[PDB]
Amino acid sequence: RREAIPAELLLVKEDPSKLPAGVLQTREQLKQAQRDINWAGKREQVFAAVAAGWHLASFALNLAFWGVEGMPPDRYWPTSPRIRLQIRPGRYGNMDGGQRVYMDYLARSEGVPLN
Amino acid sequence: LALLTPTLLTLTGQS
Amino acid sequence: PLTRAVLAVVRVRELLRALLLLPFSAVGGAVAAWQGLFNSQRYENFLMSEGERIWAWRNRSENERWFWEVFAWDRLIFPILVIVAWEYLVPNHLVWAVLAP
Amino acid sequence: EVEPDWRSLPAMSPAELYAGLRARNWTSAHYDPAAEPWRLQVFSCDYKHTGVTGWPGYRVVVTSRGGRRRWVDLAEEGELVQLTEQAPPASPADIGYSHVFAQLYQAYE
Amino acid sequence: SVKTAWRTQEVLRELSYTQLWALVGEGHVARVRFYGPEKNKVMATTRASAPGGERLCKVVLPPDPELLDHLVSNGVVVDTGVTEDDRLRASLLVQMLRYTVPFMVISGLFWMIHTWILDPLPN
Amino acid sequence: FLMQPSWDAVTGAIRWGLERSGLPELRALRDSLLPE
Amino acid sequence: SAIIKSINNKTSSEKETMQLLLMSSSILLHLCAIISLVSISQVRCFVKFHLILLYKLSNVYNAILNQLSNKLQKNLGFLVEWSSDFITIIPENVDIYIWNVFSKIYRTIPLSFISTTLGQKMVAFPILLSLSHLLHRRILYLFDTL
């Protein structure tokens, strides 16, 4: 068993021409509003994407280098900072068994797990 | 920063 | 009759596996083709000619090189900047504008 | 109302809006009964704290008789004045939403 | 005069207060921009029909309140230099500044690794 | 989180991750407390 | 943002100059502060002490974990340094490693700077080239002095 109601009590009745001057929106207006909602949807993601793509392009460029193949020697820029900066030990602070320590520090970084 | 200080100083309302 | 249609429908579903895996294998082929250019003999010929060009270019530009590496900043731009900066600060007296400089 | 696209929309100076609101404010000395009706929509940003492009202050959208729209960027509250204030700020670059809301409060007396 | 001089890299003229007053009165000033740390320097651009053509003057406006109505009456369009494009570019710069630190971290890591193992010294 | 990365964010994020995935270490607690 | 907004708003390619000036000033301020700090002798003592501590603790961790690692593969003093000068105990391949990593990180600054700035409009190309080279060499020299 069911009860029935008229469908014409639930559908509202309106008058498009009885509305104030500019209440109803035309076609171009609704298309503009749709374009605006799409722009509001994708704006932040577009901007973040560009601001990340800059760094990504720079990183790709730095990756395309891959090493020193293609790079000739240079005399204003040696590879050891001590030669370029004129750094050499003196007399004090010289422990005879400090050389011992020296070795394992090398052995610490030359990666030889013996140590 | 002393060149930019008269410009940045409007964030406090001062001269 | 049966086995042929069965292997055919498995052919088509592994073609499906391939369609859900096309961009990855495509970019893999792309990076492989990119890494293929830089192992020929052409690329080592290019590197060696580039070496010759760098040698000829180093022999003709010793003055400009020493200028840009030793002179441009340390003896041309930095002292100008330092004096102008100091005189922009440092109130308009004589002990500060001339004597201490 | 949906937020317009502020990039492709003509702009108006805040001093122009201040003069136009003094025009339609009958409590002022510069009133005239001939000015056309103006529709103002004042927007406050809400994605200020999440993501780029947020802005401070208010943004006004003016609609006139022709149905055409312009916008005004009322960031930077210019100089603090009371609601019952009738005096330009002696420098037409000092119009922020303080003077504008003073005129909007005075026009409805 | 303009007939007894050489053309030299046109510069901003200078007006005191009333030449600008008379100019905005006669309806020849076309646009003005405010600038200065003290919100009282104006750069004023005149329009074509004015005596002398389109040029750029610099004026210091002494604080007088009846200037605003004076300019707005004669159709002068007061302007700024902060159109939405430069604001969007500033926000883009801020975003890059936000990203610059993690990218430099990951790059330092990658290059520590590549210098260590993936490309060591030959012997 | 992609637009405004931070440190608290990633810490709490992998905290939630372990809560979902390996917080059953909260049961490894009792699993070690049986031999104890 | 208020910072960048202010320097954009108050002061023909001028805003980019102001922004570059701000960023350069700030980076230089922080670097000058750090170098001036570590230019004091007792602070060098401080950092030397912390370095020997971290070296020894890393050594302990390394021994322990590497030993347990090749065990799982099986499954499937202080004064001699603290009273001696710094450079005689540290090898040179370490600093060469540091320098190589630095160089490899920053070797793409000129190209990025040039591309960023460049999209009588291009009479500035020599100026941007000069700026790129000078800035790259400034970074290298700042490493050198630190």
TrEMBL record, chain A:
<protein>
    <submittedName>
        <fullName>Uncharacterized protein</fullName>
    </submittedName>
</protein>
TrEMBL record, chain C:
<feature type="transmembrane region" description="Helical">
    <location>
        <begin position="18"/>
        <end position="38"/>
    </location>
</feature>
<protein>
    <submittedName>
        <fullName>Uncharacterized protein</fullName>
    </submittedName>
</protein>
Automatic annotation (TrEMBL), chain G:
<protein>
    <recommendedName>
        <fullName>Cell division protein</fullName>
    </recommendedName>
</protein>
